[PDB]
Amino acid sequence: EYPTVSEIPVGEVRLYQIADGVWSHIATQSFDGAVYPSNGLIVRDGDELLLIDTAWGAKNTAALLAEIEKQIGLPVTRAVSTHFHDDRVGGVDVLRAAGVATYASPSTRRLAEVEGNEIPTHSLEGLSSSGDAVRFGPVELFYPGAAHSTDNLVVYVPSASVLYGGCAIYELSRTSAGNVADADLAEWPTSIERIQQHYPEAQFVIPGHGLPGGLDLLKHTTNVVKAHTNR
Ligand SMILES: O=C(O)/C(S)=C/c1c(Cl)ccc(Cl)c1Cl
Ligand SMILES: [Zn+2]
Ligand SMILES: [Zn+2]
Numbered sequence: 001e002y003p004t005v006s007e008i009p010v011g012e013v014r015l016y017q018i019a020d021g022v023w024s025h026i027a028t029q030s031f032d033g034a035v036y037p038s039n040g041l042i043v044r045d046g047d048e049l050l051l052i053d054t055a056w057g058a059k060n061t062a063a064l065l066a067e068i069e070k071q072i073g074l075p076v077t078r079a080v081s082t083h084f085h086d087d088r089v090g091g092v093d094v095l096r097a098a099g100v101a102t103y104a105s106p107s108t109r110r111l112a113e114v115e116g117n118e119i120p121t122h123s124l125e126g127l128s129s130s131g132d133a134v135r136f137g138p139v140e141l142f143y144p145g146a147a148h149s150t151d152n153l154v155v156y157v158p159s160a161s162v163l164y165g166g167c168a169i170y171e172l173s174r175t176s177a178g179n180v181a182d183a184d185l186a187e188w189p190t191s192i193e194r195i196q197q198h199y200p201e202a203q204f205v206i207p208g209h210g211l212p213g214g215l216d217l218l219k220h221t222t223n224v225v226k227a228h229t230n231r
Contacts, residue, residue: 002026002211005035013055013064015042015071018204019160021138023072024212025064027055029087038087038209041164042068042076043157045138051079051100052139052155052164053208054091061091065098076100080136081120082153082166084111085182087208092118103136105143107151111182127153131194142198144168145191146184148208152191156199163202163215165195170221171210177228185229189222 003014003026014026021044028037040053049072055064068076079095081088081104089112092102102120104112105127112119126134130145140156147168155164168191177183184191196218205217 003037005037008037010035011059011063013060013067015067018162018206018212019157022157022160022162024164024206025051025055025067027057027060027064029056029060036209039164039206039212040064040088041155041157041162041206042072043138044074047074048077049074050137050139051076051095053082053088053166054079054095056087057090058094061094064091065094078103078137079120080104080124080141080153080155081108081112082155082164082208083149083151084108084115084117085149085167086117087167089118089120092120096121105151105153108153111149111151130191131198133198142195144194144198145187147188147191148180149182150184154195154199156202161201161203162206163195163199163204164206165208165217167208168192168195168221169205169207169217170224171207172213172217172220173210175224177224180228185225188225192218192222 023042038056043050055061103122104120106123127143133142152168
């Protein structure tokens with residue numbers, strides 16, 4: 001019932017309603033001859049929408065905006081990218097051209113620039129130290145510390161008890177560490193524990209790639225990271 005790769009062709013995007021006024025968006029990308037799924041979030045804020053992450057590329061992100069317009073019919077006025085990789089910021093120029101205000105932490109903006117990736121316009125203050133949280137419209141943004149990346153943010157929707165872990169949290173079917181080129185393996189379990197401490201009441205946990213679940217995804221990710229550490 002949650003959409004998988006086989007159900008989403010290259011260039012298409014699906015929306016999945018998680019709770020009232022909260023959806024994930026699901027897209028796919030092909031690389032190195034394999035196909036990968038990717039998630040972001042959409043949160044209603046009155047008569048407008050907040051977008052969390054792009055749909056991994058310009059073409060997908062254009063399709064995302066068109067699917068939002070068709071299915072939901074409310075304007076995306078702001079978008080937050082939760083770290084600097086292309087699955088999170090690829091498509092920011094499309095958002096910007098469409099009149100969406102784009103945001104990321106100054107840490108993410110800096111790393112995107114170094115990588116040659118698209119750079120969200122606005123800088124989110126107040127997220128520089130592990131454990132920091134700020135409200136942004138209908139969500140809380142939380143910097144748990146370095147994990148999948150040094151800049152990774154998580155997002156919580158308090159009205160719906162939805163925690164969007166982004167790429168710091170792995171789906172259950174993922175048993176090996178992916179590409180950890182930019183990760184802080186040493187800190188990742190501690191950063192996960194900060195998420196658990198701050199959001200123990202979360203009822204839905206959305207990873208950056210793959211199937212949602214509950215808070216078990218946190219300990220799952222810790223297990224995978226620690227096994228990789230000991231490789
Ligand atoms: O495992 C993940 O969640 C991500 S974002 C992997 C990745 C990395 Cl490490 C660099 C670059 C790109 Cl494009 C991707 Cl997809
Ligand atoms: Zn990443
Ligand atoms: Zn990712």
